[model samples]
Target: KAIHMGGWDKVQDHFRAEKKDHALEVLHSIIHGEMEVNVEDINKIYAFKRLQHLACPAHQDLFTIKMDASQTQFLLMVGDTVISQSNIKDILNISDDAVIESMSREERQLFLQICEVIGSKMTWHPELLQESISTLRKEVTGNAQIKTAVYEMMRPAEAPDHPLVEWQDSLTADEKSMLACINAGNFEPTTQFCKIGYQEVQGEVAFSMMHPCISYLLHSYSPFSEFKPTNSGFLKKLNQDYNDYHAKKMFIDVILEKLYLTHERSLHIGKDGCSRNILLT
Candidate 1:
C-alpha cells in the first residue's frame, strides 16, 4: 500500500520538488484508495464516484456566507489574511469577481443575510452593508428574473426551519460576538459527492464547508458542546447533480444555534488567502 510504504510522502516530496499540478494527482491516487492509478490521462479524474461512498471523511467538520458593501463584491476571512471573493474559482463556481446581485436570488439572499451579519466586522466601511442590503431588498421586490429564488428566500415559509432559508429571522438577533480562530482549511467541492446531472444548479455548486472551518467552530463553541457535520449520503444518492448545492448547509444549524446563544461568531481570515473559510441560524 502506498500509504503504508509512505509513498504518499514521496508523492508530496515529488510535488514539493517540482511544485506543479501534482497536488491534485496525488489526491486522486488515494481517492479511489488505490495507488496504482494511471496518470497517463487525467481528464477522467472527475468521473470517480465509488469515491462517493467516501463518507469516512465527514469525521472532519465545517459555515455560511459573507461579502462586501457593493453587494456584488465580497471577501473571505481565513486568520490574519483577508481574501477578495473575485480572486478564487474553487472558492465558488464563479468566473469573475462575483457581483452579489449577479448571484441568483437564492445566492443573493445568502449575501443579504450574511452581509448583514459580518459586514460590520470588516476593517473597511461598515455602512456599505447597510446600502447593499437596502438595494437587494428593493431590487428583489421589483426584479422579475428569479421567480423561484424569490419564494425560496424573500417569502416567509409558514413552518420555518433554517436561518439561511429564513433570512428575516436572523435580522432581529444580536449575535455580534468575536469569533476567533487559528488556521482554516480548503474549500473542497461537494461535486465529488453529488449526483451526476445536477452537479451544478444555477451557479450553485455543492461544495464541502471545509474542515479547518468546522474544527474552529468546534473549539470556538465547545462550551455548548456540538457536532455539526452529518452523513449527507454519498454522491450515489443519484438523480443527476453537481454545479451543486447543500454542502453549504452541512453545518448551518450548529452555527445558528451557537450564534444565537453566544452573540457574535468568531471568523478567521488568512493573509495569504488560501482555499478556506461563515453563516446564520
Candidate 2:
C-alpha cells in the first residue's frame, strides 16, 4: 500500500513558492538573534526538500574534501553553522573574521543538531507513504535520541531544558494510558489523549479535532458562522484525521491482503507451514 511519493522536491517547491517570505523571516530571526528559531519551523524545513535544494551547490567539492551524498547532508549542518555564526555576529557586533574563528568551537555541535532534525523528520515519510499513520506515531515515540538532539538545538541555552526532551522521557506513562484507551476503543478520552500526545500528533490529530469542536461549541452560544473547511487550521486538522484514521485502516487492510497472499502460497505447495508463514507471523 506504500506509495512512492517523490521526496521533498514538491514540498521544497511549495515552500520556495508560497512560504519564501516566512522562511526568510525565520532565517533572518535566527541570524539576528531576535528569536530562538521554533522547533516546529525547523521541523518543517527539515521535512521538505528545500533544504536539499539549498544544499545542492555546497555538496559539490569545496576546497579539498571530495563531495558525496554525505556532503549534501553536510549542507544543512553548515547552514546551521552559518546561522549560529551570523546570530553571534549580529548579537555581539563582531566582524566576519571573528565569526570565522568562533565557528571552530560551535560548528560541529550545530551541524549535529541539523543532522538530527533532518533525519528524524525523514523517518516519518516512509510510514506516511505506507499510510501507516499509527506507525508514524510509533516511529516518533520510539526515536528518542533524534528528538532529544533536535530539542537541544532549538532550546535556548538559558532555558531549564528542552520540552521535547522532557516529553520523550515521560512517554512511557503516556503510552500506557493511550494503549489502554485504544484497546478499549473508548473515544471519550480522546481529548485527554490529544493533550498527552507528542507535538507531531498534537498538530496532526488534537489540533484538527479542536478546530471543528471550537466551531460547534461556539455555535451553541451564538449564530453559527459559515464554517470554512479550507481554512488553514481546518485543513491541517482534517488532513491529520484522514491520515490517522482512514489511511491507517487502509494500510492495515493492505497488510492483511499480503498475509492472505502468503498464506495461499504456502497452501499451494501443501506445506503445513513454510518459512514465509513463520516469517509473516
Candidate 3:
C-alpha cells in the first residue's frame, strides 16, 4: 500500500525517517535496479570455501595450503569497505579497529571470512555459522571427507572453477579462439551464450558471477527495462525466497538421483581420499 499509493520516494522517506539504512540502501537499488557489485564479498566467500576445501586432511598430501601474505594483505585493506565497521565490530566481537589490528595476519583473515559468511546470510546468524564451522573443524580432525566431497561438487568445470584469477588464467589458452570470435563480432552456431575471456588484471576488485536468481531479477525488472516503481510484482518476488527455493530444488534433485547409484558409481573417490568427480552426470 505504501509503494502503490505513495510510490518508492515516499517509502524511502519512511525508511529514512526510521533510520533503516540497510533498508534504504536496498530500496534505492530496487528503485534504480543497478547495484554496485562487491567483489570482495565474492572473494571472501570463495576464500572461506577454498580454505575449508584445502584445509581438509584428505587432500593435504597433494597440495600445501597456506594463505598467501599478499592475499591476506588484500583482504585486510579492503575488508572494512566491503562490510561495515559496525557489522565487523558486532559480529567479530571487536571493540574497535585497534583490536583487529592487534590480531595476527592469519587470524584476521579467518575472522574476515567468518564475518563475510555470516553477514551474507539474511538472518545474519553468527552462532549457526560459527557452530557449523566448529563442527566441520572437528570432523576434519576426525579425518572426515565431507568438505572435500562438497567442494568437488562445487567445481563443476574442473580446473576452470577455482578462484576468479586462477580459473580465468586456466581459460586463457583454451578460450582464445572464442575470445577472438567475440572480438570479431561473430558467434558460432553451437554457442548458446557468448563467452568473454579475459584475465583479472592488477586491481583487487575483479569480476565475479552473481547468483542466477539475482541475475534474472535484475535483467527482468531493472529500471532500464519495462519495470515501473509502482509495479510491486518485483518486490513481491524478491520477498518470496526465490533463491532459497531454487537452491533447495537443485539439492533435492541431486540427492534423490544419488539414491539410485551404487557407492562406486556415485562418485570417483580419488586415491588422495577425496571425490574426483566434478558433479553428478
Candidate 4:
C-alpha cells in the first residue's frame, strides 16, 4: 500500500500519504507550549517534529528535521535546534496541555467545543473550497480560538481565587466532571474522582460541581478536514430509525446543553449588581 501498487515503486519527484491532518494531535500540541517538534508524530515527541510540534524543546541548534507517517517513534536532535523530525516523551520535565482526559481527570471539554465551532464552521470560510456544503474553511480561525483559550487557560490568574478573571486550575474537581460516570452518572466528594458509589452526603440527595466547566470546544480537528463517510452502521444501524452525524450531533448537543449547562454556575459576569454571595443558579 505504501507504493500505491506492489513493486510499482515508480520513483517520481512527488509522493505523498494523502495529506491528513493529525489535527487532534497537532492542536493538542499547539495547546501546550512545546517548542521542539517531532516531524514523525505531531504528538510523537520527535527530535524534529513535535518538539517543533508539541513538546517543550528549546530547539537550540542548526535546526533540522523531515516527515512521514508514524508520529509514534521520535528521537532527539543531536543538533543545536529544530522542530521537524523529532521525538520526545511525557517527562518529569516537559509541558503537554491539559494532558489528561476521558478515564482520568485532565484536559477538558474544550477540544470537542473547538471541533464544533472552528472545524465545522470554518469549512465554509476557507474560500479556496467554498461549496455551500463544503468542509474546507479555515484552521486559522480554529487556531486562533485554541490559541486564545490556551492563553486564557495557561496564564497566571489576575485575581488569584477568582477564575472569572483568569483560568481556573484544571484537573481539579472544578474543571469538568469525568466523562465516565455510573449509569446514574453519580460522583462523590471526598475530593475523590469516582470512589463513593454508596456514601451519604449527610442530609441531601446529592451535590454536584458548583461551577461545572461549561464546554465550548471540540474533541476533533479539521484544519485539513474533508468530506468523509458516516463511518457507523448506526447511520443505518438497527431499526434504521436512527443514525448519522446530524442526528447524533443534535442528540449530543441537547445533552451537553440540558445536563451540563444546568449547574451551579459562577463566571461572575452577571448583569449589573448581581450578588456575589449568591451562587449562580
Task: Measure candidate 2: CA RMSD.
Answer: 20.6
lDDT of 4 by residue, 156-187 (tens): 12121333222123233422344223112322
- lDDT for each residue of candidate 2 in 161-277, tens digit (9 for 90 to 100): 211111111223433333332112333211222211112223331111112222111111111122222233433443344344433444433332332234331111112222111
User: Each candidate: what lDDT?
Assistant: 0.26, 0.29, 0.30, 0.26
By lDDT, the better pick of 2 and 4 is: 2
- Superposed Cα deviation of residue 135, candidate 4 (Å): 46
Which sequence of candidate numbers ranks them by TM-score, best first? Answer: 4, 2, 3, 1
How well does candidate 2 score on lDDT at residue 214? 20
Q: Taking the tens digit of each residue's C-alpha lDDT, what string does model 1 give over 1-281? A: 12222245455665655543345445644443211211111111112212222435552121122445554434433222442243211122222332211344344444333322221111112222234434333333223332233223432221112222111223222221111111112122211111111112375432222222111211121111111111112111110111112332434334434432342211211123321222111
Each model's TM-score? 0.18, 0.20, 0.19, 0.21
Off by over 4 Å in 3: 1-69, 75-115, 118-123, 129-154, 157-281
Summing lDDT over every window of 10 consecutive residues in candidate 1, give the lowest-scoring window. 222-231
Residue-pair clashes per prediction, in order, are: 45, 1, 0, 60
Candidate number with the higher TM-score (1 or 3): 3
lDDT of 4 at 78: 42
